[PDB]
Structures are given as structure tokens and as C-alpha cells.
Amino acid sequence: YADLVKFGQRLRELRTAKGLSQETLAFLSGLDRSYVGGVERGQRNVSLVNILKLATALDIEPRELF
């Protein structure tokens, strides 16, 4: 799915701009490292509670992932 791949690319860009590895974003969001990578690649169907964990880790409002 194209939109799961566009959402994962936005997540990747926000993470990368802040200089965090996948491993660090996974720790900060309380997520498994491989699950964060699978979301970045559109290979997971992330829950809302985890979108909010990831937005809190990036210090951004969740709307900005959309």
C-alpha cells in the first residue's frame, strides 16, 4: 500500500532530520526496533497509540506525520 509507504517515508525523514537511529527512536517510543523499521517501510499497519508514541518521541504533534 502506497499510503503506508508515504507515511513510513515521512516518519523516516523526521527521524533522520533529528539524527536518531531506528534503534533510538524505537527506545524512545517504547517499540521494538524491527517494528519501527517495518513501519518506515510500509510493512506494518501501525496503531494510533503507536503513532502517538512515535510522535512524542520525535517531539512533534502527530498531525505532522500526515
Added chain:
Amino acid sequence: HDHYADLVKFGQRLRELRTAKGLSQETLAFLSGLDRSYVGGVERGQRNVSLVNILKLATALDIEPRELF
């Protein structure tokens, strides 16, 4: 932080948008390819919606998914 508490805020927002469009829960479930029980659960903060279902709901409402946040 207890981010499941924020599901309640998102559910209220969805019910605001669904009512701003004049749809019943059953209509918005049909239009999003979902079911009335699950839509109602999400409006109440009692189900943890997925991204693909957030996009389905936004498509059915004819909004950008960002207006849900």
C-alpha cells in the same frame, strides 16, 4: 504517558467530523469498508484504530487525514 487515553480525544474528533457530514455510524462504516460496531468503538475510544483504518475513515469523510489530529 498513557497514550490510550488520547484515543478518547480522537474518537470525539471522529464523531465531530462524522456529524459535520450528516452520516450515521452505519453509513460511515459502509463507506469506509468497516463495520458499525468497530466505528462506534473507535468514536468511544474503546478500540485502537490502525493507520489503514484511519485512512479508510478519512477517505469516507472526504477529508485529509490530518484533520483527525
